[PDB]
Amino acid sequence: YYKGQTALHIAIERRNMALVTLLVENGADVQAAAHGDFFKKTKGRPGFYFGELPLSLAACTNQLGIVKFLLQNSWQTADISARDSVGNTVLHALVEVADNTADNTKFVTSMYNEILMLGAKLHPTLKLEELTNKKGMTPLALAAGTGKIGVLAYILQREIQEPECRHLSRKFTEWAYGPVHSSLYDLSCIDTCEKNSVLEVIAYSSSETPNRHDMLLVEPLNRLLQDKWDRFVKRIFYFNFLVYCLYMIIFTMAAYYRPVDGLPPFKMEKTGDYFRVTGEILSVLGGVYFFFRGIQYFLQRRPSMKTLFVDSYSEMLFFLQSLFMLATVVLYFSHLKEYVASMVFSLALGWTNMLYYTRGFQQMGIYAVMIEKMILRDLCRFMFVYIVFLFGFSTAVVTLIEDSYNSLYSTCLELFKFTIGMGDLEFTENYDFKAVFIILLLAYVILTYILLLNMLIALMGETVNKIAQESKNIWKLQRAITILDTEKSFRSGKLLQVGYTPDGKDDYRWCFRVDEVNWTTWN
Amino acid sequence: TNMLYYTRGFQQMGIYAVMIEKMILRDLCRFMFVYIVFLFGFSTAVVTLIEDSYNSLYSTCLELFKFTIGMGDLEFTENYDFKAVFIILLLAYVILTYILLLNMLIALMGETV
């Protein structure tokens, strides 16, 4: 629990820089391995993780005066990389500790700056940040995966104004003509990475992973995806939308002009049945595509059990459409007319799934997201209570009905008509007590139609006030996944020379030119 | 309808005519795209299921425009083969268009104002 904890960790955590000097002189190392349960991540534990090592403790402790000592001393030669039981360095661990609190953000980014410079002052034989833990995650990708927008904003916009420590900048200003100043944001492992690009870790994040939808508003990401969109994804996406529209046009007439005379599999006799069979072939193949394209989404991401049903909603409804399609093949060869039952569900899913492709458009794509955030937030709450009432008063009505509205379906059906403006208050005279029948419908009308539908409109109006910004930020991620999937299924930015590493060479960098214009920054 | 031009000589009415513009384009265009996707989506799905004169894409698209104006019969055909399909598919239509998307329009149309 307190395993590995030396007296030097006491000298640090108690904010006593004097004894940390003395304790290492006695032999007690500064590479001490606090592999204790208290000293690992919480995961249901009241503990604190800092990096398993003294240097990592002081960095995560509001202790800068100490951290410089753990390196600059003659007694011990504490390695600055110095991984732990999980591979995390001081820089990794210094991302594990961030909480997105503003007071924590200002602190971690200040400290995170200082160890980098110190890691360059002593020996440049590094690339600190290109080290990975035992999840194969750099601190950059670790702040993106763990949802640490504050650190991510720093690492991307990192500019250090001094000669030796500018190679570790990743925001280079190239030219300026007064108010105009032009940056050269580095793209190394934001879009092109071997392991865990920033974009492949924001967009493809698990649903919790906080601030999934804010991590892209971090400049240059909103601006780089819009470059990929305007350049080589707007053309492909609108071609994906074409083929899907044509596919739906083709699966629709092959469904509209289906046979009605016999059993399946029907047989080709006339010319017009050769045009539909292709319409049926070209229909099913897309259902193999959206099937395999859906299986891949559950084998090249392998999202958890929860992450089938909390954030993958579109990918489900194209896969689900494919299941109703590949149930429509099994039952068109099983000699069964229930393929139609599956086939109309495929159409209904299919056309509704145009509401996917309207994410290539801002005001329409935000609209498609509000629809999501109403189906789940306002319509689920509604349709639970509405079914309680509907089935509540239905039973109460069909109970009262005797001796064919003496049925629970038609009563639940006739009471669904009050809500669509088609309720007869006289759909039965087959009862024994009229005040009961009508007090019980007026109770239904008042509670469901007058109150609860109109209440839905109110809920549904309080939601729009809230998700106006969130749904734009959910829209840009949906377009991001569209950009990234297009890439995996064109290199952005040019290979500019920005400066020089502190060993003599040209620091070649793939960089994204941005052009801002201020009027108080005359320098 | 072009009287709604000349009501710009009046403040509270002329502002009203401008809100009408900024709803036709902002809220009703977004609505009537998605509404036609659903309408034509579920219509095809219904007239597919219909056999042997509601075996038509017009009248089905027409009868499904009646759920939104409060005139939708959930029994405008018995000419089908599967009733759960016909009614799950209309309730899907009603819930998505009438209960959700019209009432959502009112919400959008209220955030605009």
Add this chain to the structure above:
Amino acid sequence: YYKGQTALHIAIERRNMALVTLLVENGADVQAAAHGDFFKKTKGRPGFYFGELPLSLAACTNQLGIVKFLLQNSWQTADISARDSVGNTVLHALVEVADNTADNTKFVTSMYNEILMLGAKLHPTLKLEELTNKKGMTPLALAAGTGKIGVLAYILQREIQEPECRHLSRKFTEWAYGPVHSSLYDLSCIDTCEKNSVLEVIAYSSSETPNRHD
């Protein structure tokens, strides 16, 4: 791209008022014609437009101490009208540079005031603002067409309290009886103009033309 750019434009843009003094003494004119693609409007170009002329550069640069020098010197006699490849003067160009940012609004209107007075101190044989570019647009109509509400608010409400420079005011207070004070806003080329009244350029503006409705 950098065409026409002299070493004097360097001495200005680098905010060095000392070398601008020396460089004109060597013959390098202060009517220099920076007809370069970088020095024209963006229209899909990462450039900066200032007015194609040094006097126009410093006016659009957070440089007032320099602008008075480009006129008040014995070595060269920089014309204050001094049109460019598109006809814009310092006053026109000083509207092209406005962005409606509040920090830019306070700046351009302060500077836009100063060249007018200086344009009156040296020689009144002008009507600076009644000069037009090659679109037939004065700086007034150019701030209305280009959507520059901050400059437009200045030019219309322009009142300068001093004897010689009040003819360039266009907001004259006539009478006052304590709390009551009565203005006389000038209407010359707001409603009655030969070319491009302010109202005929706000209302009849293209749809982008920002702040049409403000």
